Amino acid sequence: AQNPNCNIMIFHPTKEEFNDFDKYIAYMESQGAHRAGLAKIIPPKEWKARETYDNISEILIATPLQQVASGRAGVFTQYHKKKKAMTVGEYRHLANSKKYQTPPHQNFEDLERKYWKNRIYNSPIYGADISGSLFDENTKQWNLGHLGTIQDLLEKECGVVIEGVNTPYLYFGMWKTTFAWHTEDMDLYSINYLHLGEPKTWYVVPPEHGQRLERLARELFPGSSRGCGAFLRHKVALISPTVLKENGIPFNRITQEAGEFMVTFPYGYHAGFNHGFNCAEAINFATPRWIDYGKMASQCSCGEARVTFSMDAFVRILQPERYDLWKRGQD
Ligand SMILES: O=C(O)CNC(=O)C(=O)O
Ligand SMILES: [Mg+2]
Ligand code: NI
Ligand SMILES: [Zn+2]
């Protein structure tokens, strides 16, 4: 078995190997990358996402989200308070202000320490979940707006044609902005490109051990667990590496820098934080190997998770028994 310790693997494809996206994902899996839940892909030196980032300031963040924490430093939830719209230039200036800017630090490990010590005492503002793309239309390789769609994959594997679309999302971050512990909708893959700015630190649980994280989460968030049998789908709970280690949960960590891709694999729980002002683009995708995970994915039916239009068909075709209850949750 390849990668039996489930370490995060880092890949350096050549420009030739960067042509065929599906083929390269399958290669990475042949080497055991999926066992970690997360892999890093450093693009060939010849590649670029677009020519410059000099003209992005007028993108609108219609609903910036202030991420307010509750709990203790290593075990907390966050809720998202909606703020007034602002442009990316306005958000960048806010990220760089004395109130929100990254503190002085020695290195990524020192910054990580400071994040876990102090996150809960601040409420950073995240420009998350903005439909759009920063890839130039002429970028032919690993262009996250030009990937094969999940609907087409389902149709190719299973023969059933379904409605829905699959487009990317932009994330404008600042110091301490946080992504809570989650797997993707329908335990899909994700791919995330850090276009510019400061790093993003990731934590990940191997897919084979995901249920250990779920059992811990039920213990640490006991009211949430009574409310919903899949409350991590709400994407609000944080648990620190120190608490994971104290509870014997297997995990790994890695820091993504500008110019790098990350791939999350089906049922790979992940969480993390931004170091400072940055912009990432991410999208879900599927492969043949996903289908079995999609059929088994948990679902939130309490009403909280509320998701895209395109998840309807995935539930309806892959999980017909669950469909009625899940759809009630959506309505
Ligand atoms: O970058 C973020 O805030 C969150 N991203 C992801 O969870 C992902 O790409 O799968
Ligand atoms: Mg602009
Ligand atoms: Ni994710
Ligand atoms: Zn729920």
UniProtKB/Swiss-Prot annotation:
Binding site for Zn(2+): 228, 234, 300, 302
Sites of PolyADP-ribosyl glutamic acid modification: 16-17
One biological process term in Gene Ontology: inflammatory response
Binding site for Fe cation: 182, 184, 270
Cofactor: Fe(2+)
Keyword Nucleus among record annotations: yes
UniProt-recorded name of the protein: Lysine-specific demethylase 4D
Native organism taxonomy: Eukaryota, Metazoa, Chordata, Craniata, Vertebrata
Portion of the full sequence shown: 11 to 341 of 523
